[PDB]
Design a binder for these strands. Structure first.
Lengths: 122, 59, 204, 137, 117
RNA sequence: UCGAUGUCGGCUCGUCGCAUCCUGGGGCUGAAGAAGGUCCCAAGGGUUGGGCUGUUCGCCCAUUAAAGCGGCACGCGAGCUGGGUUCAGAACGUCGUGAGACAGUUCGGUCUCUAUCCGCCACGGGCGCAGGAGGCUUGAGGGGGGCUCUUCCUAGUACGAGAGGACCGGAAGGGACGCACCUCUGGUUUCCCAGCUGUCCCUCCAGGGGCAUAAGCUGGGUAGCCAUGUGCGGAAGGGAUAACCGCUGAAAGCAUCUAAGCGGGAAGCCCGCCCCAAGAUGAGGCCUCCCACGGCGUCAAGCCGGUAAGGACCCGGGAAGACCACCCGGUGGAUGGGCCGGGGGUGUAAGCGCCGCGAGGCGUUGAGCCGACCGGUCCCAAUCGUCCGAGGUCU
RNA sequence: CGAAUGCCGGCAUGAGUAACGAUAAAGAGGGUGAGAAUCCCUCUCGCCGUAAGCCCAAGGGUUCCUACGCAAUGGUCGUCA
RNA sequence: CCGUGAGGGAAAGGUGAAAAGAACCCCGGGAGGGGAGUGAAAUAGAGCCUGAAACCGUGGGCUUACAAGCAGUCACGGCCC
């Protein structure tokens, strides 16, 4: 459950490290975002050079969360952080890598490259 | 005293009428078998007591 | 309009296809039709069914052997089932098939003298900043000289729940004739052991 | 009527009697994973069991794993698409039932807080029982 | 909707326990106690449990009863002269009957509690 | 209205108006398509989260289908706030010789436990419903609810000066909101289990208890109550219309949706759905029960006294409940309590054996303890009883 | 005299309502007596312990001890003070 | 009684000619009653002559649970003396 003001760790080599949610792009009033939901977010801290400077305002897609994801089959999964991946408006990732696991919910949500690029889909 | 207060002295009419449901119910009693007496049900009472059971004092 | 008296027993989940489906089990013991209303004498048509069988012949005034299966009329009394007129000797669960959709009516749990902001979800006062005896209170309830009154229907505090509730269009997931059992899509008014009635749905 | 319960127990007929027993020790096992049009691909999850939550049928259990940077905690029904379940090291000998304390303090601090349970292992010796005497005894 | 759940209670934890105990000692001592109905009604199941333990008469059970009663003299009487009296009786070793009229004081209904037998 | 009508804004709670910001109809268009513009009909439902200021409002960030404008004493302080305004203290700039003064600034500054009437939300008592009962019902009439976005298929095909992209029809996903639910997930779980410190005590060791909160502290945690969890809902469908579009058609040889008639046509009206509901004194219906004058008035209660079917009281209780009410039991009984089994929580008790100098460690042992949950068992307790209550008015 | 938020007095209403003055905490068995949750005794339980324990100043002025009492006082009760 | 003090400053009359002030019995722990008794009188019984009103009771008549009110009034009709 990500909401505006939540900080999110980034899981790619875009050059950011922390972004912080400013809106969730679901409805007109979607309260929280979860895996596969896209969000707007300000960039909070970043590595010297790269695509993403501090205070750039970017779109990312939640790929891990702290609060569990329930599955149809009754099962669940939970990460030890909330992470996002940064994306360009037409919904392709900007980076070239992605670090750490990702939830398979992104597959149904049509995030193929990200999924390929993960080391492990949980 | 402060904020709300009564606005008019209340009629004897309206008073006695509020008290409509104030009348008490007479205590509910029955006769002690094995003893000539009127007690409430479900109670061991010193006119008698019970049978193979505890009570005041009797020979 | 099918329908049967029954008792909420409680819930678990099962697996379908490859997914956990929560279900509430209902026992719809066979229901001896003990009167039929006709439009002729009663005005409207329905069938009065009976449910929980056992009884130490506590039949006094409703001796009403009148219909065949007066089989000592049911503890849990008997209810009608509006427009419905079937094989006039008992209603089983064979009545239903898996897949079918049903409306379920029972009795929501009795919450007692509820607050507003439970009875209604009201916002309640701030836990801090502002003074301190109005945290769970309802705020204003009006304007001033016009209308100089409170409206009918004002959401306020009081007896909440312990009331009829019909939840609608539940999947029947499986039917065990053998045991007069019945599985649906979980979450039916009322507590376990509790009386319910179970009718074909309204999406048609 | 009489057993509000024992009725419901009757419905749970998707029970299992094939899974090794384990408890907050250290199992690892498979799944089922949909994708690619199919409901095929079995994938293995591999971890310390953090907590079993008992309730007959629909008792669940949960498994911790360190995937790359991240911790991952899984939660399992104890039933249904779980093809196999065989366990790694019945260690723990955890002094306690629920052991979430390891979330905060995981690394080698785990290892020397969750030493082997030779007792349960040494009865898995006895359970070796692979004397090949079928059609022979 | 407080109450969908077991065991009545006025006084807070520390002091309510203290009451079941001080009633237990007392019941086991004199064999007859006189109390307000509710108090009596709860005291019933607290003692039955102790009595039962005493019938099995193993060291553990003695230790186990000493938690609530703290007195060895009394605990003995229990294990040696009370718990034997049952031994052919399973459950319900305690009786509670109400009395007529209350206290000129606050009008509280009274019951009495007996060890049965 | 000065023998007092608290006087901005905020919050909470709403309800109304339409001159409509979305959403539904529609006519003009300088409407190719898509997207606008403009007016007409239409509030049913909606109308976001932040930064700045006490602000109203406004500007800005990110969204959105949309980010409407008003009334209700600039709605709402016997509901809260008191930031501003608005007492006494202090300061600046400024005016006055001064004492002091300024909708100019600035820092600070007491907002009252008890509701009598009306109103409103709940729940009962009385009586009536023209014999007396126990059930099941009908629904006059109320209330609730009414939302909306995306993606895809038709088809990149009608249309196109191309550089985009429909109508109609068909599918699959979301967002808020509403009613219910505890299987899952996630909380609490005040004594269910374990571990810990200090001290006093029981009994010296071991083993326990008190207090460190109204749980000493810590780690877990059933039932229940719950949302972050789960299932459902708005509908389909019918009817009458609005703006609007037509058929046939005179008065008026033509023309005209109209004067006679007839068709289309809105998220709007009515019905359909969910809940209340016969005090609907207009007190309804059906099923089934009990029926007799026994003794006295002016002759059917306006009569008492026993009754009948039934019903109270008293008692055990209940996911019912402030009390009341409701529901279920009362020995023909499993209603609570106890006990037993199953679930479940804790996570190998004490004692003894062994190992180590010892703190300890192993074994016995998934032990021992063990609330509510699903059950069983007459061991304990619902003993024994009483009081009500038709005897049935007229053509 | 009917009004002066009149003056003195008595008696209403709110009302069997709010309250009964520290959340340190009680329980049982015996006595006593017309009557006892409230008095005496005992045993369990809790609270204070640079005190809520002990001793002195000031202030108060018989509140001290004992025997009788229970109208009133004691926020209930009272056999106790 | 109030106030350190100067000072402030109430309330409260009435048995009957005579106390003849109610022995004794009864219920009650007493307080109070009921009989007896005194008296011309005891609804003269002791803050007791007279004993108004507010206010609170008990009994009796008429009357009210589908009506809306400055409470009265005018008219009819019923029931009661």
């Amino acid at each position: 459950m990500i909401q505006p003001q939540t900080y999110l760790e980034v899981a790619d080599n875009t050059g950011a490290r922390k972004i912080m949610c400013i809106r969730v792009l679901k409805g007109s009033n979607a309260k929280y975002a979860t895996v596969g939901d896209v969000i707007v977010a300000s960039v909070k801290e970043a590595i010297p050079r790269g695509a993403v400077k501090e205070g750039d305002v970017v779109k990312a897609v939640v790929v891990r969360t702290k609060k569990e994801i329930k599955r149809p089959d009754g099962s669940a999964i939970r990460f030890d952080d909330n992470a996002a991946v940064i994306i360009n408006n037409q919904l392709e990732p900007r980076g070239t890598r992605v670090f750490g696991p990702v939830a398979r919910e992104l597959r149904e949500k049509g995030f193929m490259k990200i999924v390929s690029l993960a080391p492990e889909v949980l | 005293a402060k904020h709300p207060v009564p606005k008019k002295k209340t009629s004897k009419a309206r008073r006695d009428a509020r008290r409509s449901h104030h009348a008490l119910t007479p205590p509910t009693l029955v006769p002690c078998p094995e003893c000539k007496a009127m007690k409430p049900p479900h109670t061991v009472c010193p006119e008698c007591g019970y049978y193979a059971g505890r009570k005041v004092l009797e020979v | 309009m099918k329908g049967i008296l029954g008792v909420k027993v409680g819930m678990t989940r099962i697996f379908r296809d490859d997914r956990a489906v929560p279900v509430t089990v209902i026992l719809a013991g066979p229901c001896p039709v003990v009167q039929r209303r006709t439009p002729e004498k009663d005005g409207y048509t329905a069938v009065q069914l009976g449910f929980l069988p056992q009884n130490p012949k506590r039949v006094n005034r409703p001796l009403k052997g009148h219909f065949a299966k007066a089989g000592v009329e049911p503890v849990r009394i008997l209810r009608e089932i509006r427009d419905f007129n079937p094989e006039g000797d008992t209603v089983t669960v064979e009545i239903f098939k898996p897949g079918e959709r049903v409306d379920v009516t029972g009795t929501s749990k009795g919450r007692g003298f509820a607050g507003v902001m439970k009875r209604w979800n009201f916002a309640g006062g701030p836990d801090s900043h502002g003074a301190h005896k109005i945290h769970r209170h309802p705020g204003s309830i009006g304007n001033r000289k016009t209308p100089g009154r409170v409206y009918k229907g004002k959401k306020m505090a009081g007896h909440y729940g312990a009331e009829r509730v019909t939840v609608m269009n539940l999947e029947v997931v499986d039917v065990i004739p053998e045991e007069n059992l019945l599985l649906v899509k979980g979450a039916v008014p009322g507590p376990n052991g509790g009386l319910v009635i179970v009718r074909e749905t309204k999406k048609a | 009527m009489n057993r509000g319960a024992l009725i419901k127990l009757v419905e749970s007929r998707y029970v299992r009697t094939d899974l090794p027993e384990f408890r907050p020790g250290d199992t690892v096992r498979v799944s089922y994973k949909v994708k690619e049009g199919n409901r095929t691909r079995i994938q293995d999850f591999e971890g310390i069991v953090i907590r079993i939550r008992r309730n007959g049928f629909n008792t669940t259990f949960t498994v911790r794993k360190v995937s790359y940077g991240v911790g991952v905690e899984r939660i399992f029904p104890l039933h249904s698409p779980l093809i196999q379940k065989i366990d790694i090291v019945q260690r723990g000998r955890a002094r306690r039932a629920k052991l979430y304390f390891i979330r905060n303090l995981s690394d080698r601090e785990i290892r020397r807080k969750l030493r082997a349970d030779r007792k349960r292992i040494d009865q898995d010796r006895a359970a070796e029982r692979a004397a090949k005497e079928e059609a022979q005894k | 909707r407080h109450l969908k759940s077991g065991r009545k209670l006025n006084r807070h934890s520390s002091h309510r326990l203290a009451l079941y105990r001080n009633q237990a000692k007392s019941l086991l001592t004199h064999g007859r106690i006189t109390t307000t109905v509710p108090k009596a009604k709860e005291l019933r199941g607290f003692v039955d449990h102790l009595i039962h333990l005493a019938k099995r008469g193993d060291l553990h059970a003695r230790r186990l009863v000493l938690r609530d009663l703290q007195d060895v003299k009394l605990v003995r009487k229990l294990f040696d002269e009370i718990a034997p009296r049952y031994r052919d009786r399973q459950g319900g070793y305690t009786r509670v009957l109400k009395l007529a009229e209350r206290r000129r004081g606050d009008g509280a209904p009274l019951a009495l509690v007996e060890l049965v037998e």
